[PDB]
Amino acid sequence: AHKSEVAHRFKDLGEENFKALVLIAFAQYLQQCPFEDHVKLVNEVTEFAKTCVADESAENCDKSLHTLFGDKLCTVATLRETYGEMADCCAKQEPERNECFLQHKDDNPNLPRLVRPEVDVMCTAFHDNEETFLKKYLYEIARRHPYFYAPELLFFAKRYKAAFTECCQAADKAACLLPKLDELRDEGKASSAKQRLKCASLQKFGERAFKAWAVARLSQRFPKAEFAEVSKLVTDLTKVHTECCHGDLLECADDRADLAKYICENQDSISSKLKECCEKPLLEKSHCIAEVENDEMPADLPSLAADFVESKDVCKNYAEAKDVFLGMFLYEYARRHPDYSVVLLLRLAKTYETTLEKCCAAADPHECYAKVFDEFKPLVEEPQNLIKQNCELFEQLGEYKFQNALLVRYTKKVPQVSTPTLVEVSRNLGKVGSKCCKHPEAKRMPCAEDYLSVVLNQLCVLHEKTPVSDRVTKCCTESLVNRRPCFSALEVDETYVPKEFNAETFTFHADICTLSEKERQIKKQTALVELVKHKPKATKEQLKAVMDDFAAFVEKCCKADDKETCFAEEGKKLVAASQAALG
Ligand SMILES: CCCCCCCCCCCCCC(=O)O
Ligand SMILES: CCCCCCCCCCCCCC(=O)O
Ligand SMILES: CCCCCCCCCCCCCC(=O)O
Ligand SMILES: [Co+2]
Ligand SMILES: [Co+2]
Ligand SMILES: [Co+2]
Ligand SMILES: [Co+2]
Ligand SMILES: [Co+2]
Ligand SMILES: [Co+2]
Ligand SMILES: [Co+2]
Ligand SMILES: [Co+2]
Ligand SMILES: [Co+2]
Secondary structure (H helix, E strand, O other), X not given: OOOOHHHHHHHHOOHHHHHHHHXXXXXXXXXXXXXXXXXXXXXXXXXXXXXXXXXXXXXXXXXXXXXXXXXXHOOOOOHHHHHHHHHHHHHOOHHHHXXXXXXXXXXXXOXXXXXXXXXXXXXXHHXXXXXXXXXXXXXXXXXHOOOOOHHHHHHHHHHHHHHHHHHHOOXXXXXXXXHHHHHHHHHHHHHHHHHHHHHHHHHOOOHHHHHHHHHHHHHHHOXXXXXXXXXXXXXXXXXXXXXXXXXXXXXXXXXXXXXXXXXXXXXXXXXXXXXXXXXXXXXXXXXXXXXXXXOOOOOOOOOHHHHHOOOOOHHHHHHOOHHHHHHHHHHHHHHOOOOOOHHHHHHHHHHHHHHHHHHHOOOOHHHHOOOHHHHOHHHHXXXXXXXXXXXXXXXXXHHHHHHXXXXXXXXXXXXXXXXXXXXXXXXXXXXXXXXXXXXXXXXXXXXXXXXXXXXXXXXXHHHHHOOOOHHHHHXXXXXXXXXHHHHHOOOOOOOOOOOOOOHHHHOOOOHHHHOOHHHHHHHHHHHHHHHHHHOOOOOHHHHXXXXXXXXXXXXXHXXXXXXXXXXXXXXXXXXXXXXXXXX
């Protein structure tokens, strides 16, 4: 396989893992081409690989995968028809050609939404046409998420299969399945957004900013590891994110294996918990190490007060290699705080920095910087107090009513954002409450950071494409440490011009009674926002009193025969009282 990289990779990867990545890849570059067309390209390329395994001497096996992929893209007939100047790439050398192709990938393709089929239909297809069933999904998921790291999407497509295995052969397949599909969807939609943010935050902020976030996260993960070790990994980890964001998966995947290789050797130098993962095969090893549990910190926890306070060379050591010192601070503090959000640990370091800038210029440095660890406690409480205020509320209200609290809350704060956005974001923010309040107190803040980050990012992408607010924009275009407290610090818009009434917005029909919870709930939540938009000035009590009356209205007309007249004639009456109530 010296001659042929193809064969080299068709052996490092399964045929099954290969065929899927080739499919993923082609979708990701050629988003508009049909499935049938692609599975044709897949098989042409697969048959070609095998040939090279047998004889690496076979013609066109010697070629680099870069050259072979491009050659196979330019094979496509509708390349000039559908993809225009993407076809012009095909006239260039393979350095410029591949880079050309990457530049034409649509960050947001305009493809219809994927409408989930009824379980019965799906399960039938899972049985009768499994491969076809499972490959379209990778296709549909990939066309829509072109920059998504193909190997991650390979792990997602197999957890998918395990749900049809489990939920299809069950009494109630629907009630079983759709919460596992919405679950994976949610985990997959998160992972997509996490990859954008990671790549975005590398360019929109410093490599320093990324290296710092990295120090802190890896110091929690591997607490029993020297600054020098941690430091080295931060470097290699940056190298890999900088490359994977360039977009070349081949080098990206290679670097990862190499890094994982380094990690799996030297494992006693890094962490205990890396054994499981380190056994795993190529693509998976890297995947697992990213997710490995935070290793236990050494029993001996030397006071960080001794080194960074209550010492003389604090200001000396800082003067030379301050970013080593700051880094050393952050490392030391990070491993002694795996329950802290990373955006917090960084905030603390920007403090220690900010402090030592002032206090080293000071006449008495020792007495100047003696209360730095007291400047951290307000910063630890703010995110902790919002964790408890919010998880308190959640338990009382349950997920739906929690969501509805958030809807009313945010609609007043930013009434300009479309009802659909507000509804999605609030729903999703509910799931953060569900996901993370089930985590114990320690583990709560990391959890929040992960999910908020994506929810907040997705929001911050959507909005900026179609801006409606100054205050959302300031927060999105702001530091990663300061992005969340910026949103938290939002207040109600007192300048809003209440929306006009429209009865159809508050009309309702019998369907709702038998509808699915999700789609029923969303119907009601649209109304809630629309209500709050139309009457922002209204009290909790006032809105509750309506919500109580709307509730009973449904409970009634869904226990009615000829519900349709009920809904119309009680909806006329409900609407009228409501206007009276809030008018
Ligand atoms: C509104 C979502 C409900 C779930 C709990 C949210 C709590 C927000 C505060 C915690 C933020 C942690 C990240 C950070 O340290 O900035
Ligand atoms: C347009 C949607 C705005 C969503 C705001 C997300 C805020 C995330 C942090 C939660 C902090 C508590 C709620 C708040 O007061 O903002
Ligand atoms: C003032 C204009 C007419 C308003 C009509 C009532 C709309 C309220 C719908 C809110 C949904 C409540 C949530 C629920 O009960 O699950
Ligand atoms: Co060979
Ligand atoms: Co190899
Ligand atoms: Co059968
Ligand atoms: Co998506
Ligand atoms: Co390359
Ligand atoms: Co390289
Ligand atoms: Co002292
Ligand atoms: Co967790
Ligand atoms: Co303003």
